[PDB]
Amino acid sequence: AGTSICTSEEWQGLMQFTLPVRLCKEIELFHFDIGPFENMWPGIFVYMVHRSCGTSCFELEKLCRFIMSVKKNYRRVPYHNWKHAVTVAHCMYAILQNNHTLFTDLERKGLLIACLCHDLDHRGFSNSYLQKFDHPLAALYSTSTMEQHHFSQTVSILQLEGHNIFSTLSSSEYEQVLEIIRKAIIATDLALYFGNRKQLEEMYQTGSLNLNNQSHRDRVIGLMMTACDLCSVTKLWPVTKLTANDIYAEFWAEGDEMKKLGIQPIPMMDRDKKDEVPQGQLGFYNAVAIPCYTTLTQILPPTEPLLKACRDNLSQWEKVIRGEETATWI
Ligand SMILES: Oc1ccnc2cc(Cl)ccc12
Ligand code: NI
Ligand code: NI
Numbered sequence: 001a002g003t004s005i006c007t008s009e010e011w012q013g014l015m016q017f018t019l020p021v022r023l024c025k026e027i028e029l030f031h032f033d034i035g036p037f038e039n040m041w042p043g044i045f046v047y048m049v050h051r052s053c054g055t056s057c058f059e060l061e062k063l064c065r066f067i068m069s070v071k072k073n074y075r076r077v078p079y080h081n082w083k084h085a086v087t088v089a090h091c092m093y094a095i096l097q098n099n100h101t102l103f104t105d106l107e108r109k110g111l112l113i114a115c116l117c118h119d120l121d122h123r124g125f126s127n128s129y130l131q132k133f134d135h136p137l138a139a140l141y142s143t144s145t146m147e148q149h150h151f152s153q154t155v156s157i158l159q160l161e162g163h164n165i166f167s168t169l170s171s172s173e174y175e176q177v178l179e180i181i182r183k184a185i186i187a188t189d190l191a192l193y194f195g196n197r198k199q200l201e202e203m204y205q206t207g208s209l210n211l212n213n214q215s216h217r218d219r220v221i222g223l224m225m226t227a228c229d230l231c232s233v234t235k236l237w238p239v240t241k242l243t244a245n246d247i248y249a250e251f252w253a254e255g256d257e258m259k260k261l262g263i264q265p266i267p268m269m270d271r272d273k274k275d276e277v278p279q280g281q282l283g284f285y286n287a288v289a290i291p292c293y294t295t296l297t298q299i300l301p302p303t304e305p306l307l308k309a310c311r312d313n314l315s316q317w318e319k320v321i322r323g324e325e326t327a328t329w330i
Pocket of ligand 2: 118119146188190
């Protein structure tokens with residue numbers, strides 16, 4: 001109820017924060033895992049905005065208020081949380097650094113913010129659930145239901161007193177950036193990923209892909225947003241495996257709610273069907289993640305380590321299925 005606002009203590013603290021030097025080099029890398037550094041997550045986002053866009057891109061006060069309010073409008077859910085937001089934002093930063101001049105300064109600042117904001121106010125329920133049980137949000141947003149809500153939450157935060165990091169933009173650039181952000185957040189709807197990937201694959205294979213074509217650009221950005229959203233599948237196996245637990249904590253809790261309403265959940269959301277998880281991950285990697293990173297690598301060659309990592313993780317799930325797991329902690 002309402003949009004939440006960071007305290008003065010919170011945003012002034014972030015202003016005064018400094019990143020330990022050792023980390024600077026690590027953050028550049030695709031495989032970097034933010035996990036061990038919880039206190040530093042907001043500062044890591046600052047550092048990334050500053051290195052990619054410049055320290056003069058945003059007024060520092062408005063930026064710190066914005067980031068800290070963004071954090072306060074993530075809910076305490078097992079997966080679609082503040083930690084996930086920064087993880088996604090970090091993947092984008094690594095894509096952007098490796099492909100810097102392909103994207104405009106407006107696209108870079110827009111995309112880093114869109115990633116941080118792309119799951120705002122997520123409740124732990126999927127679009128399938130909201131549409132099945134006619135949540136009011138599905139009345140408002142007939143397709144891409146939660147994504148449309150996340151964009152609306154983003155705009156609400158920008159509109160808070162002293163939070164509009166985009167106010168210094170020309171009126172024309174302001175409309176362009178909100179449109180960059182809307183499209184990017186919408187593209188995180190995996191329902192849309194399937195057609196987009198198939199289109200991009202066709203454009204690439206026939207050689208029609210042209211990055212000077214706004215419709216093509218929009219699509220490449222969309223695939224980038226898919227790759228960033230799913231990037232937990234591109235970490236080192238222990239990291240990826242641990243994250244998988246949080247994803248399923250969330251799925252199972254939704255499954256439980258379905259059962260109360262007289263509907264048996266899909267196996268993926270059934271806590272009594274945990275034996276089927278490894279095969280379901282295999283299916284997810286084969287249907288979604290592998291193709292995503294495969295096509296992204298063809299379009300943006302420097303993103304190849306995301307694909308190589310994802311391939312290594314598919315192999316690990318295959319190992320689990322063959323009974324070849326070694327010891328695991330969670
Ligand atoms: O198996 C999965 C289903 C839905 N979303 C997922 C997201 C990640 Cl990062 C990994 C596996 C997923
Ligand atoms: Ni989402
Ligand atoms: Ni997400």
